[PDB]
């Protein structure tokens, strides 16, 4: 709104809302890959129930 | 897989100094509470958002 506590900025030319706030949004798109799962063996206790 | 996080602070926390009656700690990535000496509150918010 009128001031940003995160970036330490006092005064806003382009306001989001009229409330005295600042909300930070962070976002990431990510994944993993295992090409050959037959190159990897597992052995798990069965009380973890699979 | 696409993930997201969000934190909201009031605009009163732009330069909010911490009169440490007890020391202010940071949560580490290891899990340890480490003692810190910076007196600004948004130094600790930006630590936990990341």
């Amino acid at each position: 709104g009128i001031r940003n506590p995160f970036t330490g900025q006092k005064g806003n030319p382009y306001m989001s809302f009229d409330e005295d706030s600042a909300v930070i949004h962070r976002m990431a798109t990510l994944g993993v890959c295992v090409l050959d799962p037959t190159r990897t063996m597992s052995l798990i206790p069965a009380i973890l129930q699979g | 897989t696409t993930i997201r996080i969000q934190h909201k602070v009031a605009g009163n926390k732009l330069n909010k100094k911490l009169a440490m009656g007890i020391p202010m700690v940071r949560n580490l990535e290891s899990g340890k509470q480490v003692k810190d000496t910076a007196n600004m509150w948004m130094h600790y918010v930006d630590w936990e958002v990341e």
Binding site: S16, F17, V23, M27, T29 | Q6
Partner: peptide
Amino acid sequence: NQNMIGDEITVRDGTY
């Protein structure tokens, strides 16, 4: 409509 480019991922929480 603050769309993080990537390929196409569109963010929607208010004006930024």
